[PDB]
Design a binder for this molecule. Structure first.
Ligand SMILES: C[C@H]1CN(C(=O)c2cn(-c3ccnc(N)n3)c3cc(C#CC4(O)CCCCC4)ccc23)CCN1
Length: 292
């Protein structure tokens, strides 16, 4: 029931009607079940990000609990910070840190990044993923859209709307959750899975950064999933010279067998991440800067 869901959600969100201390909502994104707005904290003038989920439009409701609960009080340099969560009418509102730099999707679909830039993104995501995996947090939506940047190029992991929590007692999830093109093969095959699905999704995002799009992106999503399930681990098709470290790096991420796929803590030591540039190397790629 809808009101049954709204009632349970009211117990886990913060109390209050946040429309009191926020105004000047500017819509900047749409996710098919919700939107995302820039808002102004009326008491300080600072800008925050506010995402509003239409409760009536959630295929499966438990996911909204995951994000608001798992992310409350979470602090990491490479993770977008959630300030508060509120139930407003038929919408869940998440008030979070606003990243003015926007998504990595805008960079990857317009220009090809150099290895120093790709290494910098990988390092930021892997640092966030290693801390999250250690606490049992599975992101389940790693892609370019889930990467947000500051104006000076700092990488922050975003969109924990599909995240989940595993423990020593229940160490695996089984929900069919994620974006079809970045989904791990064990997940598409409807097997139980753990944090290793994020490592595969990261490997697909490397292909994004090199090739501009994930494999099979021209195909409909259900077609891409059948192909991920049955085909061999993609390697870069963007056949412009790639360094051997990047080649060896991707070979540790895009492993069909999750038990053989490298973990986040293992990849933090990989030679490819030595290529990582400073956050400033991301800056020229952003739309506000790349045409000057
Ligand atoms: C096509 C797009 C549609 N999208 C958007 O429009 C989004 C834009 N932002 C922006 C943008 C700029 N700055 C910020 N701070 N957020 C989003 C943040 C989240 C999120 C989240 C959290 O889970 C992170 C951990 C704490 C709790 C909340 C989700 C979606 C968006 C998503 C990508 N695909």
């Amino acid at each position: 029931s809808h009101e049954q869901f709204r009632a349970a959600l009211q117990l886990v969100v913060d109390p209050g009607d946040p429309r009191s201390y926020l105004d000047n909502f500017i819509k900047i994104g749409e996710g098919s079940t919700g939107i995302v707005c820039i808002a102004t904290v009326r008491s300080s003038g600072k800008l925050v990000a506010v995402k509003k989920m239409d409760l009536r439009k959630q295929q499966r409701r438990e996911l909204l609990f995951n994000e608001v609960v798992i992310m409350r009080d979470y602090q990491h340099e490479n993770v977008v910070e959630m300030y508060n969560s509120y139930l407003v009418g038929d919408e869940l509102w998440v008030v979070m840190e606003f990243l003015e730099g926007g998504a990595l999707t805008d960079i990857v679909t317009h220009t090809r990044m150099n290895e120093e830039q790709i290494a910098a993104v990988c390092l930021a995501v892997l640092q966030a993923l290693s801390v999250l995996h250690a606490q049992g947090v599975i992101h389940r939506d790693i892609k370019s859209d889930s990467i947000l940047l500051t104006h000076d190029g700092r990488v922050k992991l975003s969109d924990f709307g599909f995240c989940a929590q595993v423990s020593k007692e229940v160490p695996r999830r089984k929900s069919l959750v994620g974006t079809p093109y970045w989904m791990a093969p064990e997940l598409i095959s409807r097997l139980p899975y753990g944090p290793e699905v994020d490592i595969w999704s990261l490997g697909i995002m490397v292909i994004e950064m090199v090739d501009g799009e994930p494999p099979y992106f021209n195909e409909p999503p259900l077609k891409a999933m059948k192909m991920i399930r049955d085909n061999l681990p993609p390697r870069l098709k963007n056949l412009h010279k790639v360094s051997p470290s990047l080649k060896g790096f991707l070979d540790r991420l895009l492993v069909r067998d999750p038990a053989q796929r490298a973990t986040a803590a293992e990849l933090l030591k990989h030679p490819f991440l030595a290529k990582a540039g400073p956050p400033a190397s991301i800056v020229p790629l952003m739309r506000q800067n790349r045409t000057r």
